Nucleic acid binder design. Structure first.
Length: 436
RNA sequence: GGCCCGGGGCGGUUCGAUUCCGCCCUGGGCCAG
C-alpha cells in the first residue's frame, strides 16, 4: 500500500551515510579553502538544503560580488577564485561563464553573481538563485525526503530535468511543490486534478485557472518556474500520479530497463504496420545539448509538416543524438502516392481567372465539377523518402542554424534493414508504441 | 541557439497570396545552462 511502498522508496532516493559524509568533508575542505582567501560566498542548491537525490551529489558555491562590479570583473575574479580553490578546474558556460570542478572527490560548481537586496536589480538568472535559496531554506526544513521522493519519481520516469533535453520539472520547481502540498503524497494526490490551465501561486497559497500551466516564483510574480515544462510531459505526470495512486508500487521509482529488441522482430513489426519508416542521418553539430535539441525538434517538425501537407500522412516523428550523428526518424502511412493529383481552379463564372487557369498547358486537360474548374498535375516525387530528400536538399536553412548547416553539407536518408542496424531501434519502438 | 509577438523589404508557387513554401534586414518579449 502507499505508505508501505514509500517506505522502501526512501531507500532509493536518500543518499547513504558514506555518500553523505563524502559530501560533508568536501563542504568542509571547500569552506576552509575559500576562507583562507576570505571570499564572500554562499552554498546554494540541493546540497545546501540536503535535498539532493542519492547519486547526484554536487555542491554549488556562489560568490557574492558588489553591485557596481563590471560583469567582466566577476568572470575574471570568478575564474581566479575557482582556479586556486579547486583540485581540477574546467570552465563551463551558461548565461555567463563559470568554473566547474572537484574537491575531495565531489562535484563543485563555482558561480559568480551580485550580492543584492531585493529581487529587482537582478541582472542574470544567477542573481536570483541566491534569493530562491533564502526563501527556500527556512520553509523546506523537515521535508527534504519528500523533495527527494518526488525527484526520484520524476527521474525514474524520465521527466526530472528542466533543460531542453527533458523539458520536465526543475529541482526548484520540485521543492516549491513540496512546500505547497506538504509532502510527496499530497503532491501526487493533487497533480491528478491538474489541467493545462492550472496556476499555482505558492506565495498566495492559492490555486487558480490561468491561460497555461503556471507556477509563480515566490521571489518573482511574473516568472513561471515550470515555464519550460512540455505540455505532453505535464500530461504524462498527471497520468503517472493517477496510476500510482491506483496501484502503488516500487517500480515507479526504478528506472525502466532499456529493453532492446532484435532487429529482426522490429523488421516484422514495420512489415505488419505496412508503413514507410525511414530516418534522416547527418553529422551531429558539435554544440551543447541546450542548443542541439531545440534544433532537432524544429528540424523534425518542419519535415513532419512537409510530409503531411504533401499527403504522405505522417504518424509520428522522433529524433536521437550521438557523439557521431543525429537521426530524424519518421513513419508515414503512404509509401507511394500517385503521380497525378488534382488542383483546384476558379469557379466557372469567373471567365477572367478560368481563362488564365486554362492558359497553362498541362498533359491532361482540366475538367468541371460542382461549379468550378479543376486540373490534374504531376508530382515531383511519389514516396516519402523521395520527397524528404527534396525538402532537405533545398530547405536545410530552415532546419535550425546549426542542425541545418550540417544537413546542408551532408545528410542521407536510411531505411529497411540498413535502418534497424543504426543506433535508433529504441526510439523507433517508442515512436511506434511497440510493447512487450 | 529555440519559442512567442511586431515592423520593412524580397524570391518561389498559384487562376488568385497579406493569407501557402521560403530568404533578407529589423523592434520587443520569453526559455535552457
Amino acid at each position: 500500500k502507499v505508505e508501505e511502498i514509500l517506505e522502501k522508496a526512501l531507500e532509493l532516493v536518500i543518499p547513504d551515510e558514506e555518500e553523505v559524509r563524502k559530501g560533508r568533508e568536501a563542504e568542509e575542505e571547500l569552506r576552509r579553502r575559500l576562507d583562507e582567501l576570505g571570499v564572500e560566498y554562499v552554498f546554494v542548491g540541493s546540497y545546501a538544503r540536503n535535498t539532493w537525490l542519492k547519486g547526484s551529489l554536487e555542491i554549488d558555491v556562489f560568490l557574492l560580488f558588489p553591485e557596481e562590479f563590471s560583469k567582466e570583473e566577476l568572470r575574471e575574479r570568478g575564474l581566479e577564485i575557482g582556479k586556486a580553490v579547486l583540485d581540477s578546474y574546467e570552465i563551463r558556460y551558461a548565461e555567463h561563464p563559470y568554473v566547474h570542478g572537484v574537491v575531495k572527490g565531489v562535484e563543485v560548481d563555482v558561480v559568480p553573481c551580485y550580492k543584492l537586496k531585493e529581487p529587482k536589480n537582478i541582472k542574470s538568472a544567477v542573481d536570483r538563485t541566491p534569493f530562491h535559496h533564502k526563501w527556500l531554506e527556512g520553509r523546506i526544513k523537515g521535508k527534504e525526503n519528500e523533495v527527494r521522493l518526488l525527484k526520484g519519481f520524476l527521474k525514474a520516469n524520465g521527466i526530472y530535468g528542466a533543460e531542453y533535453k527533458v523539458r520536465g520539472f526543475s529541482g526548484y520547481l520540485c521543492e516549491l511543490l513540496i512546500v505547497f502540498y506538504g509532502s510527496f503524497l499530497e503532491t501526487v494526490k493533487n497533480a491528478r486534478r491538474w489541467t493545462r490551465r492550472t496556476v499555482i501561486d505558492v506565495a498566495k497559497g492559492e490555486v487558480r485557472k490561468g491561460e497555461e500551466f503556471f507556477v509563480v516564483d515566490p521571489v518573482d510574480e511574473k516568472r513561471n518556474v515550470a515555464a519550460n515544462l512540455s505540455l505532453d510531459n505535464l500530461a504524462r505526470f498527471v497520468h503517472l500520479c493517477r496510476e500510482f495512486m491506483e496501484a502503488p508500487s516500487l517500480g515507479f521509482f526504478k528506472p525502466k530497463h532499456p529493453l532492446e529488441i532484435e532487429p529482426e522482430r522490429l523488421r516484422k513489426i514495420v512489415e505488419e504496420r505496412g508503413t514507410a519508416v525511414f530516418a534522416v542521418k547527418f553529422r551531429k553539430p558539435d554544440i551543447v545539448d541546450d542548443n542541439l535539441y531545440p534544433q532537432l525538434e524544429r528540424a523534425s517538425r518542419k519535415i513532419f509538416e512537409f510530409l503531411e501537407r504533401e499527403n504522405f500522412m505522417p504518424l509520428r516523428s522522433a529524433f536521437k543524438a550521438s557523439e557521431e550523428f543525429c537521426y530524424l526518424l519518421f513513419e508515414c502511412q503512404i509509401k507511394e502516392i500517385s503521380r497525378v493529383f488534382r488542383r483546384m481552379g476558379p469557379q466557372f463564372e469567373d471567365e477572367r481567372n478560368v481563362k488564365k487557369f486554362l492558359s497553362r498547358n498541362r498533359a491532361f486537360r482540366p475538367f468541371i465539377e460542382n461549379g468550378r474548374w479543376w486540373a490534374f498535375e504531376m508530382r515531383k516525387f511519389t514516396t516519402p523518402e523521395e520527397g524528404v530528400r527534396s525538402y532537405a536538399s533545398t530547405h536545410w536553412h530552415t532546419l535550425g542554424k546549426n542542425v541545418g548547416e550540417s544537413i546542408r553539407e551532408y545528410f542521407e536518408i536510411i531505411s529497411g534493414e540498413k535502418l534497424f542496424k543504426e543506433p535508433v531501434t529504441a526510439e523507433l519502438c517508442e515512436m511506434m508504441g511497440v510493447k512487450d
